[PDB]
Each structure stands twice: as C-alpha cells, then as structure tokens.
Ligand binder design. Structure first.
Ligand SMILES: *[C@@H]1O[C@H](CO)[C@@H](O)[C@H](O)[C@H]1NC(C)=O
Length: 189
C-alpha cells in the first residue's frame, strides 16, 4: 500500500534560535506517519516541536532550534498491515556571530600597555580582525599592535596618536557571515 516515502529536503543548516519545517510525503495508503528524532525517540508533538499529519503528508516543525535538535530525523510511514517505509533528513545547527557586553569607549592612560576588549562568539570559532578608522576602515599594521589569543587588541606603550575608532570584526568564512562593533579608544595624556 506504500509506494514511496520522501522528505522535501535531504539536508538543512540553521542557526540556534531559527525555525525550520520538513514535509514527509507517503505516496500510497499510509495508516500512520511518525517522526523520530536523532536520539531515536518517537516525536510527540509539543509547543516547540510540532508534528501534524494531513492526508498522505506529515509536517515536522522545529521552532527556536537549539544544538540538541541537531542530527538525523526519520519519517516512518506504516500501512494497515504493519509494513513500514522511511526517509531521513539531516539537520545541521550552528551558532551565528554574537557580540557580548561591548564596551565603548574604553579609556587608557598614555604609556601603559592597553588591551582593548572585544567578545565575539560563533560556531565554528570566529575569525576576528581589528581595523582602524580614518576615511577608510583599514587593517592595522604596526609593531606595537597585536591581536591576542582571546581576540582582544594589545597596544604596547599606547600613545595619544593611537586614540580613535577601532573596529572589532568577526567573521565565519565558511558561511560568509560577518558582523562588527566599533569601539572608541581614548588615550588620557
Ligand atoms: C605620539 O604622539 C606624539 C606627540 O605629538 C607624536 O610625536 C606622534 O604622533 C606619536 N608617536 C608615535 C608616532 O608613535
């Protein structure tokens, strides 16, 4: 009685917090259509993770996704005799760029070794760059300046000429994702 079970998408990527749906189509005469999550459990509809069968189709909607929603889902149709067919879909879930507690301005006294703080996160880990504003926002090349392993900007023996606007830029190259925060750096003489 079951000709074919398929899901509209085979693979989908989404960020934590994003919502997505999938449609299972069971051509023929299914008696039941159920979904199983990556933990292997039969999905019982809730407010956040919803299943609805309508004719020979079943829709799974995942609202406000979290990392534990990631993995392979199965749609299993069953006919009246108890024979089953199934299809699968893969959900890949990542974390988009997120800046935390941005502080601006940040003040330093001339001569001290400054650390300009920037806190950005993502999965995979973000690639961070610091840039300096003039007419064009440009990448910094100066021997007193270095990005630290915690993504902050070290400025050795900070001078009044170092005062200005600094851009903390976060990138995830594999997605082409980019975001930034401009930080006013003040040097008290
Ligand atoms: C720091 O400020 C001084 C004072 O004007 C100036 O000579 C210069 O722009 C800065 N020194 C450098 C370039 O490191």
């Amino acid at each position: 009685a079951l000709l074919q079970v398929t899901i509209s998408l085979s693979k989908v990527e989404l960020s934590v917090g994003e919502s997505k749906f999938f449609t299972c189509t069971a051509i023929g005469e299914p008696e039941s259509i159920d979904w199983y999550n990556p933990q292997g459990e039969k999905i019982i509809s809730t407010q956040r993770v919803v299943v609805q069968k309508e004719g020979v189709r079943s829709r799974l909607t995942i609202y406000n996704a979290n990392i534990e929603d990631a993995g392979i889902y199965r749609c299993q149709a069953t006919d009246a005799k108890g024979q089953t067919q199934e299809a699968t879909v893969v959900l890949e879930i990542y974390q988009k760029l997120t800046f935390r507690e941005v502080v601006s301005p940040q003040e330093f006294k001339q001569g001290e070794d400054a650390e300009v703080v920037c806190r950005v996160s993502s999965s995979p880990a973000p690639a961070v760059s610091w840039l300096y504003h003039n007419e064009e926002v440009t990448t910094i090349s100066d021997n007193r300046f270095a990005m630290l392993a915690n993504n902050n900007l070290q400025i050795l023996n900070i001078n009044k000429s170092d005062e200005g606007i600094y851009r903390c830029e976060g990138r995830v190259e594999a997605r082409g994702e980019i975001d930034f925060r401009d930080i006013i750096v003040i040097v008290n003489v």
